[PDB]
Structure formats: structure tokens, C-alpha cells
Write a protein that binds this DNA or RNA. Structure first.
Lengths: 206, 143, 262
RNA sequence: CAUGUUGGAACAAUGUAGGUAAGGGAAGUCGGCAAGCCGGAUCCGUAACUUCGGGAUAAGGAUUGGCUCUAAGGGCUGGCAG
RNA sequence: UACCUGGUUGAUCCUGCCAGUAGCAUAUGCUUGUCUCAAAGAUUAAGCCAUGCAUGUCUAAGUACGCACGGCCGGUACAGUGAAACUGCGAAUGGCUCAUUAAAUCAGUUAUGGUUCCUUUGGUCGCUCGACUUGGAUAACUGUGGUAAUUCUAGAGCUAAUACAUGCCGACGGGCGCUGACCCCCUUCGCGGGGGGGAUGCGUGCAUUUAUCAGUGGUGACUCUAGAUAACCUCGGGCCGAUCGCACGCCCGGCGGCGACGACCCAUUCGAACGUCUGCCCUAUCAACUUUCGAUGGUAGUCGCCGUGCCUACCAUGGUGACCACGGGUGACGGGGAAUCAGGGUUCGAUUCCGGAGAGGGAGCCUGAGAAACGGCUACCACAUCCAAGGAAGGCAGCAGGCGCGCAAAUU
RNA sequence: UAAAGUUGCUGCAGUUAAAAAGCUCGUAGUUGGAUCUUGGGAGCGGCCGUCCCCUGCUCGGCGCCGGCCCGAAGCGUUUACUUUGAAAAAAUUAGAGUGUUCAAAGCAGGCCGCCUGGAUACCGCAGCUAGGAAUAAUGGAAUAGGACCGCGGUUCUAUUUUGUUG
RNA sequence: CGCUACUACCGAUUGGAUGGUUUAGUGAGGCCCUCGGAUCGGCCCCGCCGGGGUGCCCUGGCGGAGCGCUGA
């Protein structure tokens, strides 16, 4: 079909090679996943050595690692913002490796409040009338508030992250190949990584 | 400095967003008893095809030549002169193979004519299969 | 070709099998196994060429399908099974065992041993592999993956397994003074003491070995197998004691028995 | 300005002035006459011959709408702002 | 054997070739008693092929209700033999040929720390803390058929598994993580302040995906192998045995020997691919070549089994060349080798051993560990076969043979 | 193919036989002056012949008692050259072994059950290896930005040591 | 200059035939993505109503549909 052959194209000198053999089967290429954000669709491709390769074609779920205190869930992938390869990979909302995507914040806001015992984002004056997340912040014993007391001094998150939670949309980097492995897994941008990619979102806007 | 490419330029091993209240820089010994230079350890550059601050393992042959072109970016052209014995005409003939060689930016102040040691590795590009392991300064050349 | 190969030509059969030119187009291409293609001796060749139990090819198959032949302590049905260096063929009925040892020349020695000796074979570890739960392994020269090893077994060392069970008993540390079987090159089967470990970062390390007469040589490290400590081997050695006297000494020593017989 | 010094009613032949024609395609004819094709711009590409200037828009191709963006090319006041 | 000799002249001495002279290997001529070895459709036509054969295969051990056969002790099915058929494997080897192909192939050298790998061989297969054996078809068979035609198949009625799938409990009582109700102490008048026990819930193997922390074992060097945590699990799915055979033992329904086959992973073996360094005949009446159709780098991916302009996006303006690049020719597969040979050379290598390519020409694929397979398929092109004119089938550069071409080559 | 020293590297010819560009310049290409390591001790056979000593800084033994004497290890201007070893498919070739009846061949066979065969050489170039250092290449310091030396100070530095604790 | 035989060369014919790579164009085909949906199912839930638990359930000969789910 399409091939990866190291004989069809030119020399260092610009001289052209004559073909000694016709396209070999081990010199194989296949059509790309071009994997979308929709309800999950992953096809199976049989590859060299009768092994199994998982073409993700539509993909909503994926694993996103929070950088600083290592909390990672099966999170929804809501948008594609930036792709350093091609700006046409962004518009046609395609997940590839080193994509700058948007995900759900609330699976990691749920971990923060369970662990750090403080409201994260939340425009101040807003109250929860069911009152279940306020149970997940307060209502502890004597000596185990001390376990939280010494955790409140390692609590102050990056202020660039906090606004993503306040909007409810975390900027994340795809660190897996969804077309090859069959997962849109990755990690959450923090610090100078985010402060870079946020400028390339302003650079696009005008 | 860095980060005038589209993607975020970093080393893929060291993590640089860890909680607190100079970056931690990845470097390995290249092997074969070659010194890892100061600028590869102290420096602020970042290159995946650098054998000091990157994932490229030097294996097989170690060759040497003279630097002839430095117009490709983060890679150069060396020139390797040798003599070929013909057994009929019991004489030699001056030949050369000018192979494309990856010049790590740790080897900063290189000039053309400098003698350069190369180490065989996995193919970096179409024609580049060799990283620079040390740049010795050319014959004379105080300046 | 475009995959594996079933046939081996007689003209490409390796040097030491001593397979002749005029009788057959093909050789016995060995079954895949613990030993390499060129570095083994097939059971078929050993049973009919090296011993003459059989004449034809059928008669070799008519022996090992009664399940008599037992290579390194387990019965193998496969006329073309690769029997390599240190491998013991315990043919149970004749009262004969056969440890395959490199002779002073390139050939595998037709070497009868006692069952008291046959109980173990000697094995060179190739790499120290650590498994999935901090559980180390030892890959021998003949594929015997033995786990929970002694941590003082490096990866040039030779060990002593037990044929009845298959577990480490004794080991030789790779040191100068220990004996050596040279398993490669032009010195294939010279038995001397190791007296130089010459290192090269990147390329192959060469090892200088000295025979009991003081006939010194060298071999790259990948082709040396230690069989003792001092000048005392753990196995039974073939006659001549792997000395490798020169052509002009062989000439007289052939004639010294030829003339002494009458 | 009031259709070029008149109107009305028809819609025949023959004209005069415009068109279009299935399939073939110059077989028509003194002769491709008349008609038809081609046609603007942009991007490739361009032969013989040559007085080296030309031939040349040779020949031969590709493209062209609408919409919606992106980038590039400047004045002016105190390597950057307004 | 380090060799010469005849020929220009009236005669001479030269330059110089023509011609002798022996080997070799093709063809041809005339001849030929014995016997031993032994080339052989390479050269032109990688031209065309009548026909036959050339890859099929069952063990004690996946399946056996075809009386096709058969023994006798049943009513606790199966004796056993065994076509067909399902299944598993092989069909990617071998053979043939030399058309391509001039840093290509190939040879020596190395690298795979950049990857795959059926089988074999050795590991692994209560590591995970949640049924004395399950489900519904299909083949052979019976039965009815359509067709001028094929290794074409349909419809109908049953029947099997190591075919197709769903899935169990034992192991197994707890252990290790974070949780936490609550539970005894001490310290200061109470706060404050220091150590413990611990119900419950949540998660817990290896394989796979990402990220983080830490520095058993191995290396010249790892982003190696382990380790700890956080999660992930593809419904077009990793494993975590529903499998068969023997002799069958032991004992107030439990256990057990020897196999066989399968399987995630790990090594190994046969490999395979991609690279490294050096090396090739003739040509300048081929001096510049390559580049918005990838040329040479950079970055990020896509993709591949992996390394890579392998392919895209976006930059950079490079890259080879008189030490002959690029182009063109080859009556060019490459080397091991062969002939000749004082010493140097020159010439040949189609050809049995290795590596490569190719199956009329290209192209595209299925299946599988492995094929861009041709004694596989789907096209198109060239050619050609059977025919009731509707269709259908094909690939000798396998072995014989036959035609064609030739100076040139064997038995269906 | 040798003959052909009529392709000439070995090894031809160019005044008149075939042939030196009309002449000079000139970048590739080829080739390039002399020049830097000598001599002494010492062991030694029959005045002469032969071997050996004239770099440099942690692990352990033969100790000797903070210091020395000797090995195992890393490094040491390079390159060409030479020598050495490794590694180098068989078959062919050279050739060792042996009455295929001899022979080309074959890898057989040989003794009264046993013995021993089925060596070795060669493999140009390139890469590996360790000697050699003449010859030929090249490099140091000439604005001393120089080697040899401890000084004085500078920035991050992580362990022997301030009992468990900070 | 003339006769003959032979060999190449020039030569109108926008000469002819074989390869080779190739701009542009049409384009079989497999493969891939995406729609599609011919048919074939196993169910839910119900019918004439059988055999047991106490008008409710538990299993079988057989009958439609809302073709209501679900799979290939």
C-alpha cells in the first residue's frame, strides 16, 4: 500500500536510486487514526509478529496525571486548543501526542478538598445547599485536624492552575499515542510549561 | 535562550513543576572514557540528539576527521581523508568520505578546520548517524 | 528466503561434524534448541558417524523412538536435536554416557564418562537477569534459566547444575589461575590457565591463556569457558589433555606408536 | 430623447440580420469561403530556426466562484509603548 | 621451462606490426575398441507451452454412531480397525532462472542500549484475595437438487471438539497501602503538646498506558532491570488450563505417578529486517547536480515491529562534486571462485556453496510467527484455453517432454 | 590468456621511424632541502660475539616497620609504516595422512575386538590487537592567553566530626 | 575524368519501431475511514393453557406484536 522504504527517494548527492526489489511487506504503512473526540471507538489492527495494536478512532475518556501531588483519574477530554505539529490538527478536533487539550477539572477538585480540606476556586460567597462537599472539607476529630493543620502549609496551589478550576476546564498535555496504544492519556501542565503554552494561545488569538 | 519553537522545549526525564515552600538538568557519562564537558552540565541548552542531555547511546565504531561545513543547525559536515592501496600500481590515492555528523551545542566555540572525534549511534536523521564526542582545536589557531 | 529455513546443504555443514562430500546433498539441519546451529553436534551424526550404532538415517530414528537416548538428564525424541558443549548423552542400556567436550582439534570429543560424573554438567552464565518481584535469574550458555541464584555469580562465571533436578551446586569465579576451555576461534579446545584479563571499553575484551607445557595464546572473552580452579579440572578431559602439540610433533608421536607396534 | 419621413392587424412562402442542432465530422467546395474553436489573469512549461535581438502569449498543461479567516508589506508622536 | 620464429631490402641494421607457437571453452568436422569420473536450453527468446507428476500430513494420546469392516463379557456410553470430515500444522523450505540492479546487490567488518520472531529448549502457569464440567451450530452422513461447463455450490433434516463462545469455585486467613469511626496513657489548672491500639470502606498479580518519587542487580555507557505510589484495562477484548491419554494405586466421596496439547510473559535457538566502516567494470561527444512533487538539517508528531524526511506541518538554506558528483552504457546478478601465469598482471565467473532479485508485465491484498506468496487470490495489460455464447478456467525462469529462436544444449 | 618489454607498477617509446602542447602563467593534482638521541656501564661464550637498565600517580605481599622496594588498574601528539595476536564459511587452491589394483579421485581405513585418521597453510584491502619509532606526515611558547610551583582569595558544594533529638 | 564492386556518411519523409523515466489527465482494483442494514438471532413482556410453591409465583407443547431491547 503506502510504504516507508529507504530506496524510493534520493541520495545525499541528489542522485536517484533504481529499484532492485518491488515494495516489501515489512516496509508497511497504514492510514492514520486521525482520532476524534466522540463516544469511544477503538478498532484492532493485526501488526508485525501477529501482535495487537489498538487504533483509537473516536475517544472521550483518558488518564491525566496532576504533576505536583500525583492524583490521576479517568477524565473526559472536552477540547483541543494547541498542536505544535499542525494548526489544522487543532480545528479538526484531533488528539495526537503532545496535544494541548482541555479536560474536566472536578475529578481533581474532588481530590484536593478530600486531601487539603480547602475550597479550590469557588467565587467567594457561593454556598452548597445540599451540603455534602462541606462535609468533605469540615467535620473531623481532635488529633486528625492536626494531620490537616500541617497539610494546610503545603496547600497553596499554582495561581495559574486555580483559574482553570474556577472556569472548570484544566489545560492538559497528551503524553500517549492514542492512534498506537488506544488511550488519550497524558498529564496536566504546571509552572513554566503552562506559562509557555498560554502564550501560544494568546499568540494564536491576536 | 530557548522556546522560540512551537512545542515546549524541555528534557523528557527531569520534572520541573514540583511543590516548593536553576532547573534540575539531566546529564549522563557518554562512555568510552570521554569527559562530559562543563557546558553540557552547567548550560541552559536542550537537545534530544545531544549525547549528554538527550536519549542517544554511542555504540559500535569511534572515528575522527576535520570539520569542513557548519551551516546545518545543531549538526555539521566533517571530512575524513584516507589512502587506498592498489596492488598493481603499488601506490596510494588520496580519497575522502565527508559524512554528516551531529554537533551537540555543548561544543560551542567550534571553528572550521578543527579535528573532531565522532561516535557511531542510531540514525539521528536520513544521513546523520554520528554524534560529536570531542572537538580538539585545529593546528595552530590561538584565535 | 522470507522466513525460517528447513534445509542445510552438506557443503555448508560446519567444519567439525566431519560430514563427507560425495554421499549426500544435505546435512542434518539441527532442531532449534539451547545451542547454536554451527556450535552443536546433532544426535543423528553422533549416533551413526561418531559411534556407528546405526548405518542409515532410518535406524537412528528407530533408536530414539524407543526413548533410549537421554541428553543432559531428560529423554529427547529428535534425531536432529542440538547436543552442544558439556551436554551429557546418557544412553541407558549399553552402560555408556557421553559428555560432548571440544577435542584438541575443532571436533566434539567422543568422550565416555562415569554416571557419578554424569550427574552434573558445567554451565557458563551469559547475563544476570532480575525478574518481576526482585527475583534474580541466571541464563546459562545452554538456555538453562535458573532463578534464586547466589548473588556472587557474575556473568562470565561457570556453575555446576544437577541433571536429576536442575539447580546450582558449585560455581567458579572468573579469575586468573582457573583453567579454561576455549569455545571459539583457531584455539578451539586448548586447555590452559587464564593469566590476563585485557579490557577495552566499547569493543571485545581479549583473554590470554597458557597451556600446561607453557604454550601461551589469546582469545576474545566471549569464547572462553572455565572448567576448574588452579590446574585441576572438575570434568574428565579427553586423552592428550587438550595440549595441541604442533604438526611436526603429531607426525613423530603418530610414528612413535606406529614403529613401537611393529 | 421619443426610435429617426407613418400607423394597425396578422406570423405564409422567399428573403435580410441573429441563434441552435442527434451521429459523423471538410465527405461540401476552385479553395475550410462563411461559421466555429481558441481567447482575460495567475502558476508551471516552451521546439526547430536564428542576423542571438528574437521565434514566444510558440506548442502543452493546471487554476479561477462564494464565504470566512491567517500572515506579510506602512505613517505618526516618547530595537518599546501611544 | 623467465623462450621466440617467418614476412618491407640489391643486401643491411632498426622501428614495427601481420602471421606462426602452446594453453583454455564454446561450436562444428572426420573418426572411435575397453573402462572410471562427469557438463548439459546460460549466451539468441525472463519467448510460448499439449500432457503427467513436482506438498501434503494421525498418534497410547482434540473429535470415530459410514456395519466400510470386525472381536464379545455389557445394557456403567467407548472394543479395536478405519475412508470422509472438522481441527491443528506445513504449504514463506526446496527447486529453477539471472530479467533487473553499478555504494545498489554482495564480501569482510561491526551494531541493534533502535526491533520483531511459529517451533525448539529452559523458566513461568493457588503470586490477583473476587463446577462431578456450561451454552448453539456446522462438516462428513441421509436427503432433494439447478448447470454445456469447474477442485461450482444450494436447500433440507440430525451429530462432534484442543472448532465456536460464555464463565465458576477452590488457593484464601489473612497480609500491604491510604482512610477513619472510636479505644488507654502521659504533659501543663483547661487549651495547647507528645505516642499507641483499631471496626468499616476503598484499592490490591503479572501484561498494557501515562505521570511521579527513590537509588537490588547488570553495563564502556540507559530514559536498563528491579522498587514505591497514583491511576489506567480498549465490549473490532492479554494471561489467571471447562483439554485428552496411559497403567490405575492407597486407605473411617479425599489423595496420587507418568504424559499430551494449549497459553500471557521471560530467555534461548533458527532467523529476519534496519544500520556502521572500507571496497566495483566503461564513459567528460556526461561539469555541475539536488530543492515550495523531500533535496540537506531543526522541531513536534503521524506512521512503522522498531532507528530514520518513512510521510506531513512549520522553520532553516542547506546537501554531493575535478580525490570525477549528476548523467548515460554494460553481450553487468555479487562474492566464494575459474583460466592463464617467471615475477607483476590480464581475462572470465549463467552454472551446483552463500547472499540477493523474479515467477508473462506491473500493481493491490488476504491468511499467517513469517509472503507484497504466484504449484495463493483480486484487478488491469499482453497472450491464450473450453463453450449450448450464458459463462468459466489459466501462469513449466520445478521435473520430463514440445514448439519457437538459433553456431549452441539430454528421458514425457 | 601467455607470446606482448606491441599498454610497459615491475617495464616501453616521443631529435630523424608513430610522437614534446608555439610559448609562458596558473588553481586543483603530484613531489618537495638539511635539521632535534648519542654513546656508555653490566651478565656472557670462542680481541670480538650475545642479552639486558637508563618517563610518569589507588586497589594487594614477600614486606619492612609516618616512609620506601614489586606487581593487578585507568590514562597517557596523533597518523601512515612495520611486526605481533585476534577474528577470519565450507568447497576450490597449496598441502599433511592413506596402495580408490595404479591414476584423476575418495576421506577413507588400519591391526588381532582394538587402534588411529578426517592436520595445517594461504585469505589481498578496511576495522580490532599489542609491540616497534628509522623513514614520511603533522602539533606545542614568539602579543607569552606558556610550562613548572606552592601562595592569596572566589562561587555551589556534602561527609569523618558538635550523645537520640532541630 | 571514365567503368565496375563494396563500405559507412549526408538526405526530404514535422521517417518508422522498441525500451526507459515522466508533467498533466482519466482511472480498474484491493485496502481504509464513514454511513447503510438485506437477513439471521437470544431476551423482556404478554396469550389458549399445562405440572408442582401459596388470585399470586415456579417450569413447558404452542400464538400474535409495541418488531419495545440487545447482539452479530
Amino acid at each position: 500500500g503506502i510504504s516507508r522504504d529507504n530506496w524510493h527517494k534520493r541520495r545525499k548527492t541528489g542522485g536517484k536510486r533504481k529499484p532492485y526489489h518491488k515494495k516489501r511487506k515489512y516496509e508497511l504503512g497504514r492510514p492514520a487514526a486521525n482520532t476524534k473526540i466522540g463516544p469511544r471507538r477503538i478498532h484492532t489492527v493485526r501488526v508485525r509478529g501477529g501482535n495487537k495494536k489498538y487504533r483509537a478512532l473516536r475517544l472521550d475518556v483518558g488518564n491525566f496525571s496532576w504533576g505536583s501531588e500525583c492524583c490521576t483519574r479517568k477524565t473526559r477530554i472536552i477540547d483541543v486548543v494547541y498542536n505544535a505539529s499542525n494548526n489544522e490538527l487543532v480545528r479538526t478536533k484531533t488528539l495526537v501526542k503532545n496535544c494541548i487539550v482541555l479536560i474536566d477539572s472536578t475529578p481533581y477538585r474532588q481530590w484536593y478538598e478530600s486531601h487539603y480540606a480547602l475550597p479550590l476556586g469557588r467565587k467567594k460567597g457561593a454556598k452548597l445547599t445540599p451540603e455534602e462537599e462541606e462535609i468533605l472539607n469540615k467535620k473531623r476529630s481532635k488529633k486528625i485536624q492536626k494531620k490537616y493543620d500541617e497539610r494546610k502549609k503545603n496547600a497553596k496551589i499554582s495561581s495559574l492552575l486555580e483559574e482553570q478550576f474556577q472556569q472548570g476546564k484544566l489545560l492538559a498535555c497528551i503524553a500517549s499515542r492514542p492512534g498506537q496504544c488506544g488511550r488519550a492519556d497524558g498529564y496536566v501542565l504546571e509552572g513554566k510549561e503552562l506559562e509557555f503554552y498560554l502564550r501560544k494561545i494568546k499568540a494564536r488569538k491576536g | 535562550d530557548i522556546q522560540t519553537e512551537r512545542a515546549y522545549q524541555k528534557q523528557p526525564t527531569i520534572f520541573q513543576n514540583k511543590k516548593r515552600v536553576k532547573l534540575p538538568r539531566y546529564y549522563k557519562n557518554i562512555g568510552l572514557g570521554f569527559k562530559t564537558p562543563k557546558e553540557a552540565i552547567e548550560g541552559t541548552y536542550i537537545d534530544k540528539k545531544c549525547p549528554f542531555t538527550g536519549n542517544v547511546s554511542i555504540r559500535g565504531r569511534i572515528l575522527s576527521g576535520v570539520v569542513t561545513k557548519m551551516k546545518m543547525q545543531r549538526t555539521i559536515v566533517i571530512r575524513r581523508d584516507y589512502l587506498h592501496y592498489i596492488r598493481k600500481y603499488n601506490r596510494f590515492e588520496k580519497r575522502h568520505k565527508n559524512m554528516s555528523v551531529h554537533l551537540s551545542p555543548c561544543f560551542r566555540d567550534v571553528q572550521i578546520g578543527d579535528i573532531v572525534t565522532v561516535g557511531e549511534c542510531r540514525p539521528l536523521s536520513k544521513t546523520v548517524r554520528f554524534n560529536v564526542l570531542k572537538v580538539t582545536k585545529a593546528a595552530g589557531t590561538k584565535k | 528466503a522470507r522466513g525460517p529455513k528447513k534445509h542445510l546443504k552438506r557443503v555448508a555443514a560446519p567444519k567439525h561434524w566431519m560430514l563427507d562430500k560425495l554421499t549426500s546433498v544435505f546435512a542434518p539441519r539441527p532442531s532449534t534448541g539451547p545451542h547454536k546451529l554451527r556450535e552443536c553436534l546433532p544426535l543423528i551424526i553422533f549416533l551413526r558417524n561418531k559411534l556407528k550404532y546405526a548405518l542409515t538415517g532410518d535406524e537412528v530414528k528407530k533408536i530414539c523412538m524407543q526413548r533410549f537416548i537421554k541428553i543432559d538428564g531428560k529423554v529427547r525424541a529428535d534425531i536432529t536435536y542440538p547436543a552442544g558443549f558439556m551436554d551429557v548423552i546418557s544412553i541407558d542400556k549399553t552402560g555408556e554416557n557421553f559428555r560432548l567436550i571440544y577435542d584438541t582439534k575443532g571436533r566434539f570429543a567422543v568422550h565416555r564418562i562415569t554416571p557419578e560424573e554424569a550427574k552434573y554438567k558445567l554451565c557458563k552464565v551469559r547475563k544476570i537477569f532480575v525478574g518481576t518481584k526482585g527475583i534474580p535469574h541466571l541464563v546459562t550458555h545452554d538456555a538453562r534459566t535458573i532463578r534464586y541464584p547466589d548473588p556472587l555469580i557474575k556473568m562470565n562465571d561457570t556453575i555446576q547444575i544437577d541433571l536429576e533436578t536442575g539447580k546450582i551446586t558449585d560455581f567458579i569465579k572468573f579469575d586468573t589461575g582457573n583453567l579454561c576451555m576455549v569455545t571459539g576461534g583457531a584455539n578451539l579446545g586448548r586447555i590452559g590457565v587464564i593469566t590476563n584479563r585485557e579490557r577495552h571499553p566499547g569493543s571485545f575484551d581479549v583473554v590470554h591463556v597458557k597451556d600446561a607445557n607453557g604454550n601461551s595464546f589469546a582469545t576474545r572473552l566471549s569464547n572462553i569457558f572455565v572448567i576448574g580452579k588452579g590446574n585441576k579440572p572438575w570434568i574428565s578431559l579427553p586423552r592428550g589433555k587438550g595440549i595441541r602439540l604442533t604438526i611436526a610433533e603429531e607426525r613423530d608421536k603418530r610414528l612413535a606408536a606406529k614403529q613401537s607396534s611393529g
